[PDB]
Amino acid sequence: FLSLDSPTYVLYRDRAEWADIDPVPQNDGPSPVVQIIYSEKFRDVYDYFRAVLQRDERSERAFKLTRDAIELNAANYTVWHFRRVLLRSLQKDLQEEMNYIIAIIEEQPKNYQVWHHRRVLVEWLKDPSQELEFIADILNQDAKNYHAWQHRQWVIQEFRLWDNELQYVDQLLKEDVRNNSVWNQRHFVISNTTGYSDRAVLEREVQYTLEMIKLVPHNESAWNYLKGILQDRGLSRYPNLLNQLLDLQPSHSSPYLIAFLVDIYEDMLENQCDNKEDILNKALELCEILAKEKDTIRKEYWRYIGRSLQSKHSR
Amino acid sequence: PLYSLRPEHARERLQDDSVETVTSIEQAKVEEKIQEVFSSYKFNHRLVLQREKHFHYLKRGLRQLTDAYECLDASRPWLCYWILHSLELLDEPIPQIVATDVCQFLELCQSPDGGFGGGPGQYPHLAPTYAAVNALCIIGTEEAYNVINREKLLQYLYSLKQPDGSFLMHVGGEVDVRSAYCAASVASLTNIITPDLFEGTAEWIARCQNWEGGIGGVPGMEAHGGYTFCGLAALVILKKERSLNLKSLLQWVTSRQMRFEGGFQGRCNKLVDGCYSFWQAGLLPLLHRALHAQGDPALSMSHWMFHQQALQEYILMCCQCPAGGLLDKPGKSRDFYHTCYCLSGLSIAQHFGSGAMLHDVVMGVPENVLQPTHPVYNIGPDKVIQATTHFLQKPVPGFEE
């Protein structure tokens, strides 16, 4: 009802409906540190929030009061907790509360307390109907918002809502193939549905990632995805892969390719292949090319990788 | 010269492969801006941590803040920790009267249920609990150690603990790896760890490591510096680092250092930011210690496995605000969090030590050296020792008997 931006906003201390109740000031003690010189609207709302809290008053007026207190500091988890208790005691309508939180999140989408609130609402309502399209609109403003992906994954796991996620994932990859949050989602989805062992799946996946690497050679996410889905199989059970990557080299080089080649060679050496000495030299050559020339930022990483390879692939 | 100013360093600019997405448009916006900053040093010929300016910023902030800060009204022990720690790295001694005021303040933030809240009378929460205990350790006095109610602290931790090994961030709260780190940090410093307190936790943190090698905030999520710092450091405390796949974790962090900017990003294909000078690069010492404990023969004996020089160059040239305090990146406004973590970042990038090696790298004038920070707790190593000592004089509650 009475808005903080209304021209006719009146401080709580000046409101006749709160005459019966004493404000409770914050005790910061006698020489405070990190002392915030609160504006007057703020101190006034929070003086009354404290008073309402202290006596645990479960009033409709305390409920409207919490709205204000949140508008002034959406990060006050004490206020949010109290609001949830009131939501219950006053037996409030959660559909409007859902609309409240929708607007709030839209306004401050990078805030833990507010996603968590929404989530608690969804557990109470056991009703995910609004969740994915909601989440999709936030992601539409910030495609990498971490809270939004977390919440997405949580809905999907709890209400088993797997059936369209790979569709959404494919679309976002089309929008920004560099969106790591979306490759993480692809992986999240696939490992929970089919898994990666079905050969047909793994092949579609590897082919896709390679189409994507060719289209955009310096996109690390694709390369990270490639390594992720394969490395654990063992890279060397896929003999064509070595050659298919060597083919790219001339036309589509990138430190990622060079690094992958090393990962293959390392798998080869673990697996007692032929030309041990020759493979080991190709690897150490590449490490040196990385450390000295094509990825000098990681010069310390690459020198430790070369020294590991020498250390254990020897005599 | 400096690494960033050498002419081959230009070959480290983004290659978009002629294919523009939002991800590359944004990265190029930043790189172009960082190139300006680099060129600005190279017009007249000279790298300086404006200590004196940072100190004024901090000294004032520690006492009083405008209503610009109404939104940190629930994070005030964070402000104590960030500012105290920053002063500590700058080798600034903290007056008896400031120290005492913080003790008394943090005492009013302490819940009767145990733990600490964002301010006086707020409910307890793992994050300010973590910050307050760290602030109290940095102070290091007996007054400060005694502010902490250890028995209620444990009860408070018990109340957050979940069947599957995770912790709630607060009662009625959320879980992610942060709670695990906060709990471990706090529990270990105060000597309140029991047999069953962190049971399941290591396995929980481990399920947060994902296909990228890094750790996400909860199982299934994208790998991120902050959560990855928290997970690994939490395992290191518990001594169960080996639950994780360290070789992949290594490949992931090292990759987070930006070839052009010099600093680190929080997750793959996102932007450089100074705070990750601590959250990402602080993983390197933790991993060095872990791989050393497993017998690794190939570990360097002078350097962490990142470009120490380049990181210091990033912090010094791009993340100092001329008025004092430090930044995420240029164009951004100072704050105490970034002041804290850039500096913690800088100290890590200056000070290598392993077993009995010690090797420093101080970019710019030598008055740039910070004091060392402990990479698990991110307070000073002296302070860690003193505090773990003091609280070892006490039994884990109970017992005793």
Ligand SMILES: C/C(=C\COP(=O)(O)OP(=O)(O)O)CC/C=C(\C)CNC(=O)CCCC[C@@H]1SC[C@@H]2NC(=O)N[C@@H]21
């Ligand atoms: C969700 C997330 C990052 C999201 O980043 P983003 O999308 O804005 O940026 P980026 O592109 O990921 O770099 C996790 C980061 C985690 C850490 C840095 C680990 N953090 C801690 O241990 C606590 C640091 C406290 C930050 C302040 S405390 C007051 C305020 N409240 C809060 O919850 N966070 C902030």
Ligand SMILES: [Zn+2]
């Ligand atoms: Zn930052």
